[PDB]
Structure formats: C-alpha cells, structure tokens
C-alpha cells in the first residue's frame, strides 16, 4: 500500500503575478528581513492567513459559546507564545491585526540580528546556516525557525562554534595556524 505519512503545501502562490505594488512590497520585505525568495514570504503569509481565518471564524461565533471560548483561547495562547501579542493585545480581535512584519520579527535570523551577534540580517542568516547559533541547548541551522518568547533569551553562539569557545576548528584558521607553525619550524 501507500504510506500514511500525509504531507501538505505550506505556501500558496499569488493569483495576480505581476501586480506592481504587491511585488514592491514583497521586495521591501525581502530586503528588510534577509529572505531568499518570495516563497518565504508566501509561506509566512499562509501561516498568518490560517490563524487569521481561525480568528475570523471564532468572531463569527458569540462569546461563551464553548467552541469560541476554548479554541479561541487556545489560539490566543499560541499567539502569545509565538511573540505576536504579549500583554496589551490579547483579545482575539487583535490576532486579526497581525501583519507580516510581526511574524518576520520572530524569525530566528531577525532575532539574531536584533540581539547583537551579527552586523547584518544577511550575516545573521549565514551564521545560522553555518552551524553557529543555539536556542537553549539545541543548535539550529534554519533561519526560518520562529522563536517563541520562552526561548528568546536563551539565544547565543553555540557551544561548538569557533566564536562560542570550541577551537578555531576551521579549514581557514586551523590552516593558517598550521602554516605559521611550519614557518616557525
């Protein structure tokens, strides 16, 4: 038989592919938050969009309808966890008011850029891919990673990086050292 390991599309395409304004917006987003394609943006939109849809559905139901209170509450909690809302704006009408910036902010690369670590967004991204960075014990080499506020404070260079204390341990620095040694002897 077929496997049961079901799989799903994470990103819908646009609809109108050469609308100018939209394109420009996308480009701006890419610039600001160091993203590789429009695909990343689309993916994040999709992520946002599902949530938004859920919120809308919840709002269609009245308060103290069981579903609304439970599912809506859960959604709100999730949003809070994600670092989308926080203290002031936790009422389910607010989770609609999320935009793409709010979501992109919580990408790991963005966070890295914010919290010193690298001079740029691009730099941060490359750092992340190059096996530096850790988010509480666990290393992580995907820049997309949506950091939750619980594990925002616990971000730094990993245990095993060259610039997190674990030898120059490179093709470069090590090679240079070797060369120096050779020169000496």
């Amino acid at each position: 038989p077929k496997s049961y390991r079901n799989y799903s599309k994470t990103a819908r395409n646009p609809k109108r592919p050469f609308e100018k304004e939209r394109l420009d917006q996308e480009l701006k987003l890419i610039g600001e938050y160091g993203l590789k394609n429009k695909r990343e943006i689309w993916r994040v939109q999709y992520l946002l969009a599902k949530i938004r849809s859920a919120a809308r559905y919840l709002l269609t139901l009245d308060e103290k309808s069981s579903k609304r209170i439970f599912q809506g509450e859960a959604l709100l909690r999730r949003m809070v966890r994600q670092g989308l809302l926080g203290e002031n704006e936790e009422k389910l009408d607010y989770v609609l008011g999320l935009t793409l910036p709010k979501l992109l902010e919580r990408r790991l690369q963005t966070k890295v850029f914010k919290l010193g670590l690298a001079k740029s967004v691009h730099h941060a991204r490359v750092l992340i891919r190059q096996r530096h960075i850790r988010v509480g014990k666990q290393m992580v080499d995907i820049p997309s990673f949506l950091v939750r506020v619980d594990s925002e404070k616990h971000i730094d260079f990993a245990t095993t990086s060259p610039f997190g204390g674990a030898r120059p341990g490179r093709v470069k620095r090590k090679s240079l050292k070797k060369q120096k040694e050779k020169t000496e002897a």
Binding site: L27, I30, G31, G34, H122
Partner: protein
C-alpha cells in the same frame, strides 16, 4: 510553394559568441542586490 526558405533568417545572422561576465549572484544575495538598487540608497 517554398520549403526552400525554411531557416533563412537564422542562417543569415552572424554568430556573435556570448562573452565573459562576472558570474551572477543567486538567491538571497541577488534579492539583496535588487533591494539595494531599488529602495535603500536610491530613495
């Protein structure tokens, strides 16, 4: 009529070969470059 003329114009045109270029940037880098060209310094 004439199937004799099939492949006229292409044949006629002089073959100018491509040329060396600075190996282009790709993905993220390219996007960054585009952004720079459009909005950042020109804006």
């Amino acid at each position: 009529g004439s199937l004799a003329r099939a492949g006229k114009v292409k044949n006629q045109t002089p073959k100018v070969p491509k040329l060396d270029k600075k190996k282009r940037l790709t993905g993220r880098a390219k996007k960054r470059q585009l952004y720079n060209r459009r909005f950042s310094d020109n804006g």
